[PDB]
Amino acid sequence: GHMTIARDIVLQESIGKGRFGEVWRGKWRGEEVAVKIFSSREERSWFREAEIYQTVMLRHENILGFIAADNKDNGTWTQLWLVSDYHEHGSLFDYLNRYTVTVEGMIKLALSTASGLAHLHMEIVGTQGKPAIAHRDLKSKNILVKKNGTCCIADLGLAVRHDSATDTIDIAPNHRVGTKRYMAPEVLDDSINMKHFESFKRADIYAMGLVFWEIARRCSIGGIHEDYQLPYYDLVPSDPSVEEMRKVVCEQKLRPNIPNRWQSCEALRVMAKIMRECWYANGAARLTALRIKKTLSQLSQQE
Ligand SMILES: Cc1cccc(-c2ncn(CC(F)F)c2-c2ccc3nccn3c2)n1
């Protein structure tokens, strides 16, 4: 047996959680892996996440490397496991909280995030085809940072997949499923047309703009940077409700503040412009992940 299976994995350290499930660092045949553990009553969440990660042609350097879905019976109860690559830096949230980044560092984090999202959103029609996938819960706590300073998107459990041939979404989607702070205006005010798959891709773009803002604040030039904050830290309380978010984002039409200092640097000007073009209230006006990837690729080439 060359494939990775739960019985051959030994848990070493508690490394936080997912939306559901508790995450552990484990060792499998001398290698470190991440293990997310679900109880038997969470089978639906575990299965749906296993199903998304097993999507044909999903693997990409900027998408969390999925290893296996398995069960582990300890003799008393059964644990439902998801196994993935382990990334020592943890989340982009943790990384931005601990460190400031250089201009190069910022571009690498933003471009790799956009590249993973472009891959997730991309449909490949035909044999061994890949359905377009929308995340529905993109945020800095759901992105991991690799040793090479690039990102990979994770926590795909709330994802939705599109079948173009039938023009259907694989599940009956519930309203407002993600993290309230990052919900797009149309999700907050429930005007989103959930029968149109493009609506979910657009809502992901809004959330990515918020993540770019979080990264840009940590970009240090001449030792000048902003402290770590979540988007809307200045307007909403911790654990904000849908109503608190909707009043700020939909009624007052506010977005995270773009500081004056971001105009003094070309990379920061490009980043600020992408943010504004992710934050439009009208989802159809927003940039695509593919267009953002191309813009940031052009910027990394120049740098
Ligand atoms: C399919 C699967 C298997 C195992 C873990 C996870 C996972 N879910 C949420 N997070 C946290 C964030 F990434 F969303 C992780 C996760 C993944 C890798 C990792 N390395 C260091 C900490 N890590 C946490 N997912």
Boundaries of every domain in the chain:
1-88, 89-303
Cβ atoms of residues 146 and 215 within 8 Å: no
CA distance 216 to 268: 7
d(CA 155, CA 245): 22
Q: Domain 89-303: state its class.
A: mainly alpha
Buried b (16+ CB within 10 A) or exposed e, 64-92: bbbbbbbebeeeeeebbbbbbbbbeebbb
* Residue 83, φ and ψ in degrees, nearest 5: -120, 135
Q: 37 phi and psi, to 5 degrees?
A: -105, 130
Is residue 28 within 8 A of residue 4, CB to CB? The reply is yes
Resolution (A): 1.8
With the most atoms of ligand 1 within 8 angstroms of its CB, the residue from 9, 54, 84 to mutate is: 84
Residue 104 in tokens: 């190069």
Nearest Cα to Cα of residue 215 among 150, 128, 293, 282: 150
Quote the DSSP letter at residue 91: B
CATH no. of 1-88? 3.30.200.20
Q: Which residues line ligand 1 (CB under 6 A)?
A: 15, 18, 23, 34-36, 53, 64, 66, 82-84, 86-87, 90-91, 142, 144, 154-155
Spatial contact of 301 and 109, defined as CB atoms under 8 Å apart? no
CB atoms within 10 A of CB 248: 18
Q: Tell me the technique behind this structure.
A: X-ray
Burial 17-35 (b: 16+ CB within 10 A, else e): ebbbbebbbbebeeeebbb
Give 240-295 as a 3 state SS string.
CCHHHHHHHHHHCCCCCCCCHHHHCCHHHHHHHHHHHHHCCCCHHHCCCHHHHHHH
Residues sharing a CB contact under 8 Å with residue 128, sequence separation 6 or more, in sequence order: 56, 57
Nearest to 109 by CA among 136, 141, 138, 146: 146
Helix axes 266-278, 289-302, angle to 10 degrees: 180
Binding site, annotated residues: 15-23, 36
